[PDB]
Amino acid sequence: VDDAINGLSEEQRQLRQTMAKFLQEHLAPKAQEIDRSNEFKNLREFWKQLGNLGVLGITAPVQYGGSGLGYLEHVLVMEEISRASGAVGLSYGAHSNLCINQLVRNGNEAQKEKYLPKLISGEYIGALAMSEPNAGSDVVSMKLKAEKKGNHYILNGNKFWITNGPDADVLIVYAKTDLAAVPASRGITAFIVEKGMPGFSTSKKLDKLGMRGSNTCELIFEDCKIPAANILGHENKGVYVLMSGLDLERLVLAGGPLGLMQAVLDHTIPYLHVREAFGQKIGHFQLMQGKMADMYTRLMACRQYVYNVAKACDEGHCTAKDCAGVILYSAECATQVALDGIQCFGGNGYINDFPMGRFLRDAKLYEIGAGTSEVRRLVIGRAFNAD
Amino acid sequence: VDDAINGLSEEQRQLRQTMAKFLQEHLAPKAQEIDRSNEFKNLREFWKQLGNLGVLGITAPVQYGGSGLGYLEHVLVMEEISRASGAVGLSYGAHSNLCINQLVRNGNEAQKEKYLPKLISGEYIGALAMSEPNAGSDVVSMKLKAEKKGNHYILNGNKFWITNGPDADVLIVYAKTDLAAVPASRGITAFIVEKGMPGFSTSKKLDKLGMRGSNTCELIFEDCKIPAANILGHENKGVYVLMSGLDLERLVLAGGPLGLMQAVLDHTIPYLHVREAFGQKIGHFQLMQGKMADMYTRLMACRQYVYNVAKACDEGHCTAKDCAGVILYSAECATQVALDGIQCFGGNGYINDFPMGRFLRDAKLYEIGAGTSEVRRLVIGRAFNAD
Amino acid sequence: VDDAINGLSEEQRQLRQTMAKFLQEHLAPKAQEIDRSNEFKNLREFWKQLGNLGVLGITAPVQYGGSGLGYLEHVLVMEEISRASGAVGLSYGAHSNLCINQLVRNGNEAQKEKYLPKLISGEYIGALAMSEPNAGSDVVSMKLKAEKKGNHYILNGNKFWITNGPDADVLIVYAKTDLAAVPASRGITAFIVEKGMPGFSTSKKLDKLGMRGSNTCELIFEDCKIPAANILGHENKGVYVLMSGLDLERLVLAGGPLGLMQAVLDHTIPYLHVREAFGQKIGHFQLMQGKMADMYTRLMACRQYVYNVAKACDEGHCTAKDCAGVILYSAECATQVALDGIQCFGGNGYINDFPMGRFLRDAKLYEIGAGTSEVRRLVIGRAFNAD
Amino acid sequence: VDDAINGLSEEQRQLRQTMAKFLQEHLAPKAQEIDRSNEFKNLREFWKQLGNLGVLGITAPVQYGGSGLGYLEHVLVMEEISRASGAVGLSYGAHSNLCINQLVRNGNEAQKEKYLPKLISGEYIGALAMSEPNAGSDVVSMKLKAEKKGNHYILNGNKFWITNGPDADVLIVYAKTDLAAVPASRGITAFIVEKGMPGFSTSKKLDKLGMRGSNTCELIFEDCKIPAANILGHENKGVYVLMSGLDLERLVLAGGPLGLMQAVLDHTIPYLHVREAFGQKIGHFQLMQGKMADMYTRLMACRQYVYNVAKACDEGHCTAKDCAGVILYSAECATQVALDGIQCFGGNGYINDFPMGRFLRDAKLYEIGAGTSEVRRLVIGRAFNAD
Ligand SMILES: Cc1cc2nc3c(=O)[nH]c(=O)nc-3n(C[C@H](O)[C@H](O)[C@H](O)COP(=O)(O)OP(=O)(O)OC[C@H]3O[C@@H](n4cnc5c(N)ncnc54)[C@H](O)[C@@H]3O)c2cc1C
Ligand SMILES: Cc1cc2nc3c(=O)[nH]c(=O)nc-3n(C[C@H](O)[C@H](O)[C@H](O)COP(=O)(O)OP(=O)(O)OC[C@H]3O[C@@H](n4cnc5c(N)ncnc54)[C@H](O)[C@@H]3O)c2cc1C
Ligand SMILES: Cc1cc2nc3c(=O)[nH]c(=O)nc-3n(C[C@H](O)[C@H](O)[C@H](O)COP(=O)(O)OP(=O)(O)OC[C@H]3O[C@@H](n4cnc5c(N)ncnc54)[C@H](O)[C@@H]3O)c2cc1C
Ligand SMILES: Cc1cc2nc3c(=O)[nH]c(=O)nc-3n(C[C@H](O)[C@H](O)[C@H](O)COP(=O)(O)OP(=O)(O)OC[C@H]3O[C@@H](n4cnc5c(N)ncnc54)[C@H](O)[C@@H]3O)c2cc1C
């Protein structure tokens, strides 16, 4: 049970409640299996069901079936889906926030009419590829080379850490078009790869600590022909598209840790008042009361920060400093909240029959696998150095 | 330079700008001396100026010369005054929040038309006395005994930790009327004492670590005859008025830790781009960048939390759990940020010529003074036990 | 490469090096499988080899096959075994410390000659059973009943959280002997149970977050007949033998987190000088350098504290306050050190192919399992109170 | 009361007992006045008594009056003197460690008899000048020009943060003898400035947040003539002296925070069993018990670390990163311990009539003064990339 202190309107509260209701029956009872089997068998049907609620294209234009709402509703949906399951939350983020929004921002008429319709309805799954086995933070150091042989581009290289890679029908891959660039940043271009393109293949899904179920794999390009129309933006200006939405991307990414902390609380608060020790509830001891208070305060502070920054980006004033600070705070507080959740459960939180360990294993992903806290700190630092 | 991300209206932004200009012109240049001499020799003139500005009754009805605004504007004014001077911020909070709001909630019309006008105009200074030498947290265990004699009450005892005691003309003390109450709670009565009442005196001001300038002393009552009309609320019900506005009090007192953090930032950020080491600005090393990011994110999160909780209490939904969590989080983060503001200043942060140490010495009070962190943690905990 | 600053002798360093050489070829290369399969297929033969090395009875008398050494050597062996695999380290701590030492302290000549030889040689595996499905911290609220039937005892009940349960041949179980004692403490007795006893069985091994491979199950007693000679200590005096070594148990169990921290450091430090970002090694950036410094300082402090307390308990001066503080500090620092180590690997630190996640999942047991941080904190606080 | 878990010999126990018995009579009763007046009125007589005791030249040969002991006995005296007064402890660390060890290490037979025989007895007070108003951490970026004009050197410039300056008779200063070196590291030389030399002047005392009583000032040299025989080491090789006086300078300065933590504990533990709240001693509450436990464990871990690193340095094994980590841990733990002690004292911990605020204000110097947390972290990090 959340509060009205967040400042949500009725429309946003109705959305949050509907998403919670849908997840409690369609995603919540499966979170334990998805993590155990490291697979989401109903991924396609769950996507088709999410595309019927209008949350996939929550921010895309209504012209292509989207809802046309702001980024606060997107953060709410992300928080709910991550409260139901972290892996599916990360998948929804990679699909609707990294791929769809990138196309509505930089996609031209033909591409937006070809891909978005099926991307907002759930027929296609989306993925974004800007990381390599040797370039995860030094993104400009990618080693996927695309050479223009006339009206086509021959792509060769590898891409790693691609969420929804083995299930995505449309992918946005950044390939180095000219290694001889004055800055390297001016030598990368964005390409739209489709499933079935000769020369494009995927690797075996990764076995990760947490967020198991969000299929991450490697993209192998062996002389892959990409038409000249399948370029997002312009040639050699791929960094423009790469950085155009990074702030709004880290903004929506902050919803995952919020949902994980909410789930941790939803299991810690009731358990502490049922389990008893020394003749009284364990949730009545001063230490556990202070732990609960600290967890609740951290969760509420992060929630208010993220929601305020989201409302701000919805009005016109949207910066990188705050979009990075929100995620730096949320991803760093979620791990401590998860640790406290396991410490509150004790011996029962250490067995994989309770979801206390999954929350911890999933909250660390946002710290080292979706942008590092070190890079988010330096972003704010350099934003202060430029003023 | 504050950001329009917290969701402030045009009128609130203009109020903040006016307060900042007035404090930069009249209060800020003296903040260093008020702490050196442990006295604000222009206290009454500054109070009259604040009353002419209309911020001493920011939350008081317009019937008594107040502004009649919400608690968000009160938090803004407190934050600004504490950004200028923490001791004067505490003195203003002990006059407008602990005293003026205590009279517009449990005071009859006669007690209001007599004290509130001059308390809002700046002629009278206000103080609250609900703590004793042996009762800091266990406020229910008082030793200031008030025995009725006809239509008057003979008060005898001592009260400790009374802000503005030496300067207050109207103080709200809590004496113990019924020394037979099975619940001590209903054995306390609130009395409105005035400077000059025979049998009421004050001790010498305290010499505290920080907040030097907010005159705190001990009140002595020796056969103090108080009329039966100078009693706040109903006799033997002096815990209802004590808890009637404790949540709003903790909310309005959360601005001090906000102003202190904003002040340490306004000295750390400009200083890290004027000081150089190893040939480059010290604000360019990754360690200082991470420290800046951490403190800025903490300040922003605390600001969003407290501002949203204040906006909630101005709409009819005002809870005690969040009103305690905000103050706890803000008091902790303010000390944590002040400890990193002295580290970003090097040896210059250890000399009393720079304001870095004063910020820490003033922020520690919000953690140990004006309510303890353990009490707030236990309140937040017991807010879950009853559910 | 550990530092010889803790103050070890030449024989202690020889033991450290021998155990390291043995475990770098017999245990270390299997740690990834043991955690993946949740089973140590070579448990019995590895135990026979460990007993041939002379560390299973490192603190047992030479008369029964032990080594007659102190507790510092026990801590060193525990650390060296947990450095290669935390699960096998916990199993070694459960057998060599909670079972053997308990029998050499409280056992009689017959009990010391019937079990200790094979317990030290490796033929027999040992376990200790005090915890129950509803008594983890409240160790005097057990629900295992033992009714005296002439010269025998009929045991009925169950026990939970028992290390080496499915593999143990000699177990020490605490059962309630009188349900009418003024303090419950006076109605508990220890019993030496042997595998193959009519009326004793075990449950399926638990699927735990970490320490996978250290078989932990539930002991089911259904009218189990235990002779009277199998009583460990004296009937109705079970808490005296349960608290006779709790201090030394907490002391020796502190080596686990030390080994886990040493392992995460040995895996991180070399990785920071190979991985390259932005041209230079990632270990040349100030943030990673500070993280390495913090991890190294925490590890060194924990090691010094544990080793000094172990040297102290070996000379006659041994206290519960320090034996609890060492384990509390080590377990609380190991989790943060493993978190930062995962933070030092990036995406590679989130895939199960690297051992960074296993370290975090194992270090968390020493804060919830084998004791909790709150119990040790309260023990220290009450030791302070008793002064 | 100290516990003999550190592994101290009988001689060291007796030394600590004597130091405590002396400081409880001659230094402890006057610490509050020393902090208030920012001056020690019995500095010379106290020093001479400390020389008659024999703990000034503790780590110095017996020839010149020293005791001929190790660095552990030296850390013991530093801890015991900072336990009674942090400012006098810093002054003693500046005179006994930064002026006498540097003289026995890099001093000739002529210099080791003109100054040392009266620096070990207390007649002369010692200081060291490596910090200037423009370089505290970039200690290579000194600006103090020394011109060789035959049989003398002419010094011109200014220095800053000089403990014992206003009272030191001998000062080991550093000056740029060659401002055109390829590395600026080799353009520096050390000199022995004796008080009274024409040209050398001391500025006015500093008004610091803490350590009030340890007089600090600026060193102004305006054409100051120094004989060539007063050269410490050799010409244009002053970085060698500065780096030789670095590891054993960071090691011994770790007793300061240890003594401050011990002092805060000696006031918190007895005060939490006398103060009453809610009808019981505040020392019996779970939160206060956990605070006491955490403080005791941190103090004990820091003590074990510092004393083990000092025992390894008394047998030959010294390491830069270990001596930088001991203090990095001790100083960072002392501030938290002082904050927790102030929290445990409550309102009484905010008035200057209690020594908690003094402990806090003094524990922050070791994090900014005598080095920085960032510098020590970066040193420890720079100790790994080299392997
Ligand atoms: C759509 C998408 C989905 C992804 N999903 C996942 C996923 O589910 N899981 C996953 O693990 N990854 C995922 N990734 C990849 C993830 O973003 C990268 O792994 C991450 O950026 C860091 O990976 P790395 O190991 O290459 O970083 P590294 O550079 O190898 O990290 C080394 C360490 O050094 C630090 N560091 C690096 N450079 C600097 C510097 N200049 N200054 C200071 N510190 C520095 C880093 O913060 C880190 O702690 C995904 C990427 C994309 C595009
Ligand atoms: C208008 C006004 C102004 C004031 N101004 C000041 C001021 O300027 N400066 C100032 O110092 N004080 C001031 N006070 C008093 C301040 O509120 C108290 O100092 C504070 O509540 C702590 O009380 P104490 O000093 O008696 O400490 P105690 O409460 O006696 O301290 C005991 C310690 O134990 C803890 N504790 C108490 N109960 C429990 C429990 N049940 N469980 C666990 N821990 C517990 C406390 O948190 C504290 O850490 C003021 C009060 C009023 C009404
Ligand atoms: C030989 C042996 C081996 C074991 N091996 C394992 C193992 O491998 N894995 C494993 O998971 N477990 C193991 N256990 C169980 C472990 O010891 C318990 O899990 C632990 O002691 C307490 O957790 P709990 O869930 O049983 O108790 P709970 O009471 O449910 O603990 C819940 C939380 O409440 C807190 N709490 C309880 N009382 C108080 C109080 N008065 N004040 C403040 N806080 C309080 C606890 O500290 C804990 O954080 C083992 C036990 C034994 C005897
Ligand atoms: C006899 C004697 C007495 C002394 N007394 C004192 C005393 O009373 N107080 C005291 O504080 N010191 C004292 N010192 C030591 C010296 O004054 C301190 O080091 C002082 O802090 C000087 O540093 P600064 O503030 O000028 O550094 P600044 O450069 O002014 O500080 C800038 C800040 O950025 C950090 N920083 C700088 N460079 C880097 C980098 N490359 N990467 C990351 N972070 C960086 C800092 O360490 C610092 O927090 C004394 C020394 C001696 C020999």
Numbering used by the authors:
A (entry chain B), B (entry chain C), C (entry chain A), D (entry chain D): 6 to 392
Quoted passage from the original study:
Isovaleryl-CoA (coenzyme A) dehydrogenase (IVD) is an intramitochondrial flavoenzyme that catalyzes the conversion of isovaleryl-CoA (3-methylbutyryl-CoA) into 3-methylcrotonyl-CoA in the leucine catabolism pathway, transferring electrons to the electron-transferring flavoprotein (ETF). Consistent with other ACADs, including short-, medium-, and long-chain ACADs, IVD is characterized by a tetrameric architecture composed of 4 identical subunits. Each subunit of IVD contains one noncovalently attached FAD molecule, imparting a characteristic yellow color to the purified enzyme. Dysfunction of IVD is linked to isovaleric acidemia (IVA), a rare metabolic disorder characterized by the accumulation of toxic metabolites.
During purification, the protein sample exhibited a conspicuous yellow color, indicative of its interaction with FAD, a cofactor that accepts electrons and stabilizes the conformation of IVD. Thus, the original structure of IVD was resolved in the form of only combining with FAD molecules, achieving a resolution of 2.55 Å. To enhance protein stability for cryo-EM analysis, additional FAD was incorporated into the sample buffer. Each tetramer of IVD can bind 4 FAD molecules. The base of the binding pocket, where the isoalloxazine ring of FAD resides, is predominantly composed of hydrophobic amino acids, while the opening toward the neighboring monomer accommodates the adenosine portion. The cryo-EM structure reveals that each FAD molecule is coordinated by residues from 2 adjacent monomers within the IVD tetramer. Specifically, T200 from one monomer forms hydrogen bonds with the isoalloxazine group of FAD, while Q323 from the neighboring monomer stabilizes the adenosine moiety. Other residues including R312, G384, T409, and E411, which interact with the ribose and pyrophosphate group, arise from bordering monomers as well. This inter-subunit binding mode implies that FAD not only participates in catalysis but also bridges monomers to facilitate tetramer assembly. Therefore, the binding of FAD also plays a critical role in stabilizing the protein structure, as validated by the modifications to the buffer system, where its addition reduced the protein’s propensity for precipitation.
